[PDB]
Symmetry: D4
């Protein structure tokens, strides 16, 4: 019943530490409460490089939309997200459905 969103960003060359600092020090404190279930947050060591992956869990897809909606209109997030966006070269996401044998489910 739970769904997982995987977000995958390609960060501009040289800007990774900048990106992590903003999220570590400001972004995540705003975003996590609202979205509700940060599962994990990663920087790739082997594979595609200058890559961050974050996973978020949700009770449903319309719970997701409601939460993501609340985030988009949060004033602090509105101030924050333009500063992060300028460091992102490309992004994509996908909806993952856990199997009945997934520990995250």
């Amino acid at each position: 019943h739970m769904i997982v969103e995987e977000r995958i960003y390609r960060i501009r060359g040289g800007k990774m530490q900048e990106y992590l600092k903003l999220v570590r020090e400001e972004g995540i404190a705003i975003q996590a409460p609202i979205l509700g279930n940060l599962i994990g947050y990663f920087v790739t060591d082997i594979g595609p490089l200058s890559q961050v992956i974050h996973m978020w869990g949700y009770a449903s897809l319309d719970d997701r939309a409601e939460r993501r909606g609340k985030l988009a209109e949060d004033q602090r997030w509105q101030a924050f997200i333009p500063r992060l966006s300028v460091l992102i070269e490309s992004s994509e996401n996908r909806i993952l459905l856990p199997t009945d044998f997934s520990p995250l489910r």
Copy 2:
């Protein structure tokens, strides 16, 4: 829900991403459900998640594995290759896989899973 940490333990995460052959998803899943994960998990030691993509690249499976180091990973993946039940199991699974790739992810110090 929330996680709570008091001391660091070093951990890496492997993401494996397979494109399954059209028409084979339920067969792939059934093999893993009924046989493979019961062999695989105890040996590799820390399964994190196992997913089928609903929006994105389709006929796609994604699974995550926690390890202490990359040598620990190598040690455990070598035990798995060496396991007799696995040797009989993996050829039946591998034939259903069109493509595969993996990568090593390092959790940030603010990752709940870490």
Copy 3:
């Protein structure tokens, strides 16, 4: 309203076969259940042996519910394996119409 874009690559030589299956059996089953087929296309210039189809929904919940109904439908279950063997690759995405999209 949201639009799901599904994009399939079909096995070389099997395009007419795929379309025949959909035309004569699949779309009759699929369309009433899913509700709102927007378009169904074969690529002529671009990635080739490519089929693209678009479906409208009220929400992602609504989509999930309808597609679950489709997965549970006996005719679909008998049909989809014949179609799946012709699909070499597939992907999809969710599109939000802008406020100036004539389709919105």
Copy 4:
């Protein structure tokens, strides 16, 4: 019969709302009458992100060429398009032929 051109653009990080404002307030009023049959204009929510997709109907490809050539010589479009273009990281297109069971046909 009718053909559909699908145009898929990757917009620079943080510039999506800027891009939309230009199209909403200027571009589309110029472009649409000349090109003739705007079918749809979308932003991707799940999949490749910071992506816009727009579809244009034409009676034939020679007619597409005539109309896109007209657009390119229009003096308002010339003044407009460079302001849009600096926000586009990547672009591509394709020619879709509707099936006899496509509602859009």
Copy 5:
């Protein structure tokens, strides 16, 4: 002004010589008179491998559609193409517009 179609096929591993034989001995003799203007036909030696590229000249895209439609209706092509298509793992095309300094224009 002329247009050029570049068609790009990836051939199944081990099937190249078989693919080339079919085209050399059966296909191209049917195909070229009907499409009208075969420019070049190539096998990649360095790059994506087991790849053939072939380039076709047309006066216009409507002419292309008219000629490609005739090819599709031709009895000999219809008995032929299924044997070639089974060898094609993947395909794509694009329409190239020569520049005013292009030797081919």
Copy 6:
């Protein structure tokens, strides 16, 4: 004979500037030294903001020598930085015409 296909993606908005540079300055330096320009194209349908140019050579050692001469040419060293800044990505490949290829 060998054909090299070079395929460039041009930064958004910079196409006309790329073509102007090559038209008025670049190709007059380049073609004589490289020796056999086959074609030069802009993609209208497919990957966009895309330039494709084809070059004929007697062999790959000849190519290496000729592209070597080009990179040492004073005029070309004065030109190429202005062109190069406009190219967002690039790739090339070597194509061997078949025995039934008109261009051979």
Copy 7:
């Protein structure tokens, strides 16, 4: 002087061991003498999977052309290659030029 060719293959799922068995026991004894300078032969453990990479050293690309010609025309190679090819899903290559600070050069 010396050029490097990097060949990168994707092997059909489940066929890796069979592919290496063929190359180890029959292929490489034919191939390597004729091509002259096998630098290295690898299987990918992290990255794109079910992937082999082999690097060949050549004095020049004309010498490569001549030698690859000889290989293609070799009777032993001709008996061997079809059996390997059936296991190859896709392939690609590129020419690498060592820098003046490359130990391999």
Copy 8:
């Protein structure tokens, strides 16, 4: 056995010679001792272009992780790497396992 890492970078258009100057004159002297086993360093001439490839041999992935840790911490490297990184458009790595019949193994 020994493991090989292949690092593959796409360099910004027009910045290649600037990239090589930095590595040739400063970077490689810092980096090669600390990592210990530079196999090769290449620029692609035919294939994906504006592409740099380098290879590093290691005894183990842990030993790799230790040496990359030392490399990261090195103060001369911290001053160098931001200057190189600004020229890199994208990067990726993979771990290769030499076959038992690879000369490099």
